[PDB]
């Protein structure tokens, strides 16, 4: 089979994980999607000439059993860590997601991309500089996105695939 990249989208409730995923898969903005639904989605794409499958888990937070969270973190190859640029708490929550994924995977080398979503809004509490400072400390890419306009969406997901490829070559 063609290569499949297992991607996981994490971040506080309300940041736009479902809207980003639906824009990536369906190329539509869905402005209302039940915050409590967690599901996977698939898309066959071409990234840098490689025909591959993106198998994306759109997370929704706590699970019935914490073993389910640990399972998807171990299964996932790369993580989109999403905050919203007008929600400081969602940005502070990135520290928890970064820690938890490394902790579960028991790894100091986990492919991740920091995503600052809702960049179409002038209303902002997290400046680009502050998010760049955090991504610099993690040694990962940072991309500002808008699930509404689709700005940065393919970049965020395709960059994560490229980070997974760099990890595999070691």
Ligand X SMILES: Nc1nc2c(ncn2[C@@H]2O[C@H](COP(=O)(O)OP(=O)(O)O)[C@@H](O)[C@H]2O)c(=O)[nH]1
33 binds ligand X (CB under 6 A): yes
Shortest Cβ contact with ligand QWB: which residue? 40
40 binds ligand QWB (CB under 6 A): yes
Among 9, 57, 112, 126, binds ligand QWB (CB under 6 A): 57
Residue 55 near residue 7 (C-beta atoms within 8 A):
yes
Of 72 and 142, the one with the shorter C-beta distance to ligand QWB is 72
Contacts of 136 (CB under 8 A, 6+ apart): none
Record the tokens describing residue 5, joined without a space.
């990249």
Shortest Cβ contact with Mg ion: which residue? 18
82 binds ligand QWB (CB under 6 A): no
Closest separation in Å from C-beta 43 to ligand X: 17
Residue 88 near residue 39 (C-beta atoms within 8 A):
no
Closest separation in Å from C-beta 56 to ligand QWB: 6
Give the whole-angstrom CA distance, residue 140 versus residue 133.
11
Of 41 and 120, the one with the shorter C-beta distance to ligand QWB is 41
Of 31 and 48, the one with the shorter C-beta distance to ligand X is 31
Among 19, 80, 85, 161, binds ligand X (CB under 6 A): 19
Which long-range contacts does 132-140 make (Cβ < 8 Å, 24+ apart)?
Answer: 134/91, 134/94, 138/98, 138/112, 138/114, 140/112, 140/113, 140/114
Give the whole-angstrom CA distance, residue 62 versus residue 108.
24
- Residues binding ligand X: number (CB under 6 A): 18
52 binds ligand QWB (CB under 6 A): no
- The residues with which 169 forms a beta bridge, in sequence order, are none
13 binds ligand X (CB under 6 A): yes
Q: Which of 60, 57, 29, 26 is nearest to 41 (CA)?
A: 57
For binding to ligand QWB (CB under 6 A), which residues are involved? 6, 8, 40, 55, 57, 72, 75-76
């Amino acid at each position: 089979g063609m290569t499949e990249y297992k991607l996981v989208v994490v971040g506080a409730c309300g940041v736009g994980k479902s809207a980003l995923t639906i824009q990536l898969i369906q190329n539509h903005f869905v402005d209302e999607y039940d915050p409590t639904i967690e599901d996977s989605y698939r898309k066959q794409v071409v990234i840098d000439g490689e025909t591959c499958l993106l198998d994306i888990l759109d997370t929704a937070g706590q699970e019935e059993y914490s073993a389910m969270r640990d399972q998807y973190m171990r299964t996932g190859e790369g993580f989109l860590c999403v905050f919203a640029i007008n929600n400081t708490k969602s940005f502070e929550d990135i520290h928890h997601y970064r820690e938890q994924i490394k902790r579960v995977k028991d790894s100091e080398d986990v492919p991740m991309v920091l995503v600052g979503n809702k960049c179409d809004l002038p209303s902002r509490t997290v400046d680009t500089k502050q998010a760049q400072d955090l991504a610099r400390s993690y040694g990962i890419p940072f991309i500002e996105t808008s699930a509404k306009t689709r700005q940065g969406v393919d970049d965020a997901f395709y960059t994560l695939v490229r980070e997974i490829r760099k990890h595999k070559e070691k």
